[PDB]
Ligand binder design. Sequence first.
Ligand code: SF4
Length: 543
Amino acid sequence: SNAMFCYQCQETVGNKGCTQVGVCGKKPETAALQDALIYVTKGLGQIATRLRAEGKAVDHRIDRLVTGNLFATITNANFDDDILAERVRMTCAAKKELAASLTDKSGLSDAALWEASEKSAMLAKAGTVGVMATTDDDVRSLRWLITFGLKGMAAYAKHADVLGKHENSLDAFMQEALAKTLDDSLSVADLVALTLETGKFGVSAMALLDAANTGTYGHPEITKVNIGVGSNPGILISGHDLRDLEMLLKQTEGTGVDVYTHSEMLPAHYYPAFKKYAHFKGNYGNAWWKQKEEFESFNGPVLLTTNCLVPPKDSYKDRVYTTGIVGFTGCKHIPGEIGEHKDFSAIIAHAKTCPAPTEIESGEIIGGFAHNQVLALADKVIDAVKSGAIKKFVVMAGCDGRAKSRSYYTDFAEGLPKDTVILTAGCAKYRYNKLNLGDIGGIPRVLDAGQCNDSYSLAVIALKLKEVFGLEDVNDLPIVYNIAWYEQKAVIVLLALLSLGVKNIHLGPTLPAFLSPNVAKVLVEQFNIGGITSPQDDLKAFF
Ligand code: SF4
């Protein structure tokens, strides 16, 4: 008997499932608490959906509980059992109160009705409500594909909410879709439909977050980002939340403490508002998975605004600070998941007692090619395609990870002919954004649109090109998709692209373990999804 079962990320054991301990470090009781939390969140979703159908209000506090719950269970987000158990209690309390408001309680699921306050009872329940609770391979596969897409959607929705933007249709959809994943009456056809609908609301969530980010901090613009370091004490901010950065920059003004970004905070440099803080230094290091080395050499405190946090080495654990829904037992936490004032005074004081960062590399990288910036360059991009200067774009967006096989993405990028342009977003970029790939007529051969959510900009750009060229099908553009995935945000990006009609996506370095043979067949037959082989073979075959 397995102590746990989790298969939601690319690194799952054997591309089958983590059954003893997660490759990410997630322990079985942590995994169990997350399974219980997801179950009661789906129950809450049913109750909220039923209230809306009865014409009754559902407060936005409930929406926030749902998004925080989903995000807390995303890969590398929260390993803190005390926090996870308390989210289970809060969810049980909330859904019991909401159910009291229903006129008709008929048909409420066990997830809607079940509750526990004792951790032991949560762990026992978890054992019978995990992935394996669904017997049927295709229904199971689609339920979990949808659930994972919803987690990614919720993450993006939550960042938009932190910045003051929320849409009732989006929160209502997430809650309804969660509930549908426990409805045994839905057919495989119903669940394939729901998968595509999930992709559509993925686009909606990304659009909302794009509007929130750009509306608050300006549209990204071309930017040179220093990757070397200064000589002052610093704080390294990681994850994705731009509001946390704004507060940190404001509070470090005049202190003598510099602020550096890491992994998915790199794109903050591209926003005009952040360029007005003189102590906002560069981007330090590479993608999340190198952090045991890079957080050590940074020397100063590190703030995780979201995933990915890897279980920290004892050498720097005392200077790791979590915030939002991030957690790790024994790491200091700065409270807040709604963009409210956060007091960074302790992290600033801590930074002053640490050495300045140890430099890993020097120079700069260029980015800021999000939708406004690229549409401003559209005529020139179009002219370069028409003249043959740009023969192909390769979308290499997505999420990086530890696997040795990901050398493929570096080698593929290096081996591309010099008449191609790489479009990127998300930490997948680190496999090739430190190479020297040049330019085509002044256009850099790597165009970084931003965070994984800024894959939205890549879709907007592709749709603009489709319009200008007068094409009937987006797939007739000279674009190859060679996307790397790791966790559930990458999953929603993939579903979003499928909902937009993008075919021929090459996904890697492996295909998700949660795709059953029949579900994978639908994706191949209707969307021509494929995987990777060697970089040299694919450099021939993909073109
Ligand atoms: S999040 Fe990934 S590595 Fe961690 S337990 Fe789940 S499948 Fe395994």
